[PDB]
Amino acid sequence: MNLVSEKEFLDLPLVSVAEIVRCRGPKVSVFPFDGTRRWFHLECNYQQAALRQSIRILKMLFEHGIETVISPIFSDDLLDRGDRYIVQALEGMALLANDEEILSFYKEHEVHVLFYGDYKKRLPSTAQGAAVVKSFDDLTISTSSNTEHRLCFGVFGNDAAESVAQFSISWNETHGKPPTRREIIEGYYGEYVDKADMFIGFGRFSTFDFPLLSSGKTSLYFTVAPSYYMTETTLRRILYDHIYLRHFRPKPDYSAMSADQLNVLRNRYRAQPDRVFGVGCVHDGIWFAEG
């Protein structure tokens, strides 16, 4: 339970890992679907392919015991692409709430789906967009009885400030008092969600689109390859690091360590004095982390 080795963890059967996760966490994980286009021009040679991969990873995440997955899918730069790109995107959005296989996926894995972000005001003031919003509203309610997992799709969910302000102003007008943090979170995500226990990005070290759910306890990981490339081994090593390594116990007692130990520890830092993770190099316009 508390003393499983990485090797065993890596050898254990799926159901076993899931049980460990259900107990130790991560309860909430952020997994944006990024680098999609790149993955497309490298493995397939769109909207339809991206989805099968999204479904694969989501399936994987939930089958490993993770209760809630927060997945940013569309951020600001969107409205700045061509008209066709926007249509392709709005179609992808429509697929998350309309496609046959993913709907089966939600039902098969008892997944309640929610959407967050500024999509209701930002989405194109057109028909196709009003359809996406209606679709989003419908799915959220129709998957309402599923209780095994929670899936939150981020659509323009990069800055919740103005949204929190307005949500708070209305709540106080109708309730007489300001909302609690819990109510603020329910208001934005549509349901209460604990802080994120980990964020798995890729490439450039950066996080985004999970307003109010971030804390110093959100373990950060950045794969070298794009989101859809996520393998089993990689996921388990990430899981193992967060569950067993990030918060090691008992904490360290310096005063109890020998003068040599402190010395060995000091060298772990001074041996390579200028070492830093996050600096990279560029190849074909693509940034890659060094060291």
Q: Which residue numbers are catalytic? A: 34, 38, 46, 85
Token digits of residue 145: 């009885």
Out of 23, 107, 166, 192, the only residue in the binding site for a second copy (CB under 8 A) is: 166
Whichever of 151 and 213 has its CB closer to a second copy, that residue is 213
Contact status: 44 vs a second copy (CB under 8 A): no
Q: How many residues bind a second copy (CB under 8 A)?
A: 86
How far is the first Cα of the chain from the last one, in angstroms, to the nearest whole number?
Answer: 33
Binding mask 263-282 for a second copy (x = CB under 8 A): --xx-xxx-xxxxxxxxxxx
Contact status: 2 vs a second copy (CB under 8 A): no
Contact status: 223 vs a second copy (CB under 8 A): yes
CA distance 199 to 219: 6
Out of 179, 186, 191, 194, the only residue in the binding site for a second copy (CB under 8 A) is: 179
Residue 187 neighbours by CB distance under 10 Å: 19
Token digits of residue 238: 């990430």
Which of 101, 73, 103, 100 lies closest to 88 in space, CA to CA?
73
Q: With CB under 8 A as the contact rule, which of the stretches 39-47, 58-66, 105-113, 119-127 interacts with a second copy? A: 39-47
Q: With CB under 8 A as the contact rule, which of the stretches 46-54, 61-69, 107-115, 254-262 interacts with a second copy? A: 254-262
Q: Please enumerate in sequence order all residues whose Cβ is within 8 A of that of 269, keeping only pairs 6 or more positions apart, or say none.
A: none
Contact status: 7 vs a second copy (CB under 8 A): no
What is the smallest separation between the CB atom of 138 and a second copy, expressed in angstroms? 29
Contact status: 80 vs a second copy (CB under 8 A): no
Token digits of residue 287: 């940034």
Are residues 289 and 277 in contact, defined by beta-carbon separation less than 8 angstroms?
yes
The secondary structure of residue 279, as a DSSP letter, is: B
